[PDB]
Design a protein around this ligand. Structure first.
Ligand SMILES: *Cc1c(COP(=O)(O)O)cnc(C)c1O
Ligand SMILES: *Cc1c(COP(=O)(O)O)cnc(C)c1O
Ligand SMILES: [K+]
Ligand SMILES: [K+]
Lengths: 429, 428
């Protein structure tokens, strides 16, 4: 990589949610292995992010690599219209067996946002087949479900700047963000907002959609499992579908295989992404019940009206199957449990730092919320100089390391977070 | 694959736009090579579809394979927030260099539908930043732009069954489907489009169309004068033009981009499918400096979108390798020879009782039928003829890999002609 290559990237290549006229520095990565990212200049960094949740087995994993290359030798891709193949069947078998019993019908797709769109369309088509005028979604504030139009319509309106699209996006129902903590006690006052909305709009709600236990991109919030139990039963009593968006929480990150297990509930529709392929490449899956899948097919259309070009991509399914096979050992349970204790113990000191507002840990997720916004360019430089890849945002300095991280590597990450928050050097902007 | 594996697929796995309560047969593919798919029973099928447009270089291509394996060796994926990498920079260099001059800012995404959602959000954010109340899209009937909700809102309302979602989808503007054929130009074809532009020019964010070929919406092929006129109209009104070339891009119609047929540049270009050589999903939305800077100087301070796997190194490496095959220029004469053979060999379908129309453009050949096909029976007929042709509704069409041999292409056209001789494979 040359400096001319880096100038071209700055001038011509958009990156996720960041200015093109005032872009901040991007670091050139040439390769990755184990729990490390290797920069163009040779500097090695301990990855604290799993490339945003997904790389739960780290990088260049022997089993994922071997399965991907083996699938390339068979066929990287073939269409799924009128065709089926082993990678898709194996993957769907595994997804059906590892999720709650009622979830036995799988719609594979290309990204998390598309999986959410699929879920929302299944809820809308479901009710249309039943002859009921249900088109509204009840969700929580601080929620994040993706960047496409449908997904955006259930994302937090303030966080996502819905004023930009006011009049274009459909207006859904937003209950207050859950207050009771995963760490703490249950507070029944938490339910009043949700109850009031359900009471007023019960007859037009197609589905409730939430991120179970952890609200990721909307605030790295960790709430009490009683909420899901309460929501499930309200949905059961009212006849409303429950959509659980586990695109960030799925595949053991919160300490359980699926975060819905924390409440011992099953949704009607389940969305999965990120970590599904072990963070090797994009893929997603939307699982639903037979009741939903057949009801839609019996309606006017005669089928569920969705079908992406690369649906069922053999290469991504073979990578996902290898990733799930590693999880079948159950080793992730102990790894995640160990990461959780180390994050609790090592981020605990940060509660006394003057820049820190809160410290919360769940599974392989460790969050240090600050009182003021971080200075993105300065703090990112600091982390890179400490030999760590930690990508902060707003007032959140968080870690979600690969499950294979070593204790020495995890300690370098926590040491860096604590050092970052000791004074105001890297704060505001 | 066992018999039980196939039963599991039937009852538990959804497939594109097909019933779960009356599932129709699916064929188990174990591998693919050159221009052939290999079934589990060992039967080899000539692929007439390119796995829906994308596999323009066929399957198990040695160059595509080596490039993907090599990138797996470096890293298959790393996040793009705060990071960049060589596969992404090389792909963006190629995309900017090969598209019209003004198109120089690339937003990589994961699928065609997302690339269209991105294009639509660019247009909306662009006008929001300029302080103009513009939220309508003007499009053509019979268009297809994807399956996510924003993309669905500009898809043909009849074809895409908008009654299913009436009230959830924003209401856009639909001009008549272009009549003039790819054929003589009729000035009256423009009336409908002009009427809508006159009444809503103050409110239109962008015009969005599939240039020259309307794909999933009917495999329609229209006159390039339409694009010339639409570009001029957009310019005069200051409206953005979005060209969706997710199906037409990378040589399929005979030109590298179908916008070239009119020598026009859109303000926003969407690319997908064939971008990776049909190896895996990836998409890209290109726009101009004017659009991209204006958005970033607005209140959000950036373009508000960023998928988890944005810029995925593995898919970018596959697209770079696919584009490096096209750089040879061999596709130009390959597509030109395919077009001749399609014209010559689908000509006889004009003597068949079940045909309504025959139309060819570049490496696309379409036989429109009078009655809907019987999907299960016709699919099986094709499989038995040693070919993989996937029809839908009243269309039996071919879009083969550019490397297809004349003898393989002949087996496909012969099979199509045989299927349209009488009513056997029609209705259901
Ligand atoms: C990441 C994420 C999404 C969107 O996934 P993409 O692959 O970015 O489109 C959806 N929902 C949640 C909860 C996520 O974390
Ligand atoms: C294929 C197609 C799309 C949608 O792409 P997906 O990858 O299926 O989401 C959008 N536009 C056109 C013109 C296409 O042909
Ligand atoms: K299940
Ligand atoms: K260009």
């Amino acid at each position: 990589m040359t400096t001319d290559d880096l100038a071209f990237d700055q001038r011509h290549i958009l990156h996720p949610y960041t200015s093109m006229t005032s872009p901040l520095p991007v670091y050139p990565v040439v390769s990755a292995e184990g729990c490390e990212l290797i920069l163009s200049d040779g500097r090695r960094l301990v990855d604290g992010m799993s490339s945003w949740w997904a790389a739960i087995h780290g990088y260049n994993h022997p089993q994922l690599n071997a399965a991907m290359k083996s699938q390339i030798d068979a066929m990287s891709h073939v269409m799924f219209g009128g065709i089926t193949h082993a990678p898709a069947i194996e993957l769907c078998r595994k997804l059906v067996a590892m999720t709650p019993q009622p979830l036995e019908c799988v719609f594979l797709a290309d990204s998390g946002s598309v999986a959410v769109e699929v879920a929302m369309k299944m809820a809308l088509q479901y009710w249309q087949a039943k002859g009921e005028a249900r088109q509204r979604f009840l969700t929580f504030r601080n929620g994040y479900h993706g960047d496409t139009f449908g997904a955006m319509s259930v994302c937090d309106p303030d966080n996502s700047m819905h004023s930009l699209w006011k009049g274009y996006l459909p207006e859904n129902l937003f209950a207050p963000a859950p207050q009771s903590r995963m760490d703490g006690e249950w507070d029944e006052r938490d339910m009043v907002g949700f109850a009031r909305l359900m009471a007023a709009h019960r007859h037009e709600i197609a589905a409730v959609i939430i991120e179970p236990i952890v609200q990721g991109a909307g605030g790295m919030r960790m709430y009490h499992p009683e909420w899901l139990k309460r929501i499930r039963k309200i949905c059961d009593r009212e006849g409303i579908l429950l959509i659980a968006d586990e695109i960030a929480t799925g595949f053991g990150r919160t300490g359980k295989l699926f975060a819905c297990e924390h409440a011992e509930i099953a949704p009607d529709i389940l969305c999965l992404g990120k970590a599904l392929t072990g963070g090797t490449m994009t893929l997603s899956a939307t699982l639903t019940t037979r009741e939903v899948a057949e009801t839609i097919s019996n309606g006017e259309a005669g089928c569920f009206m969705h079908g992406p070009t690369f649906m069922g991509n053999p290469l991504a399914c073979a990578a996902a199957n290898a990733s799930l096979a590693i999880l079948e050992s159950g080793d992730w349970q102990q790894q995640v449990a160990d990461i959780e204790v180390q994050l609790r113990e090592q981020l605990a000191p940060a509660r006394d730092a003057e820049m820190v507002a809160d410290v919360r840990v769940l599974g392989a997720i460790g969050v240090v919320e600050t009182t003021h916004p971080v200075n993105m360019a300065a703090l990112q430089k600091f982390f890179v100089e400490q030999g760590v890849w930690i990508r902060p945002f707003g007032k959140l300095i968080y870690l979600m390391p690969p499950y294979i991280i070593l204790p020495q590597q995890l300690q370098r990450l926590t040491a860096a977070v604590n050092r970052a928050v000791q004074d105001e050097t890297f704060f505001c902007q």
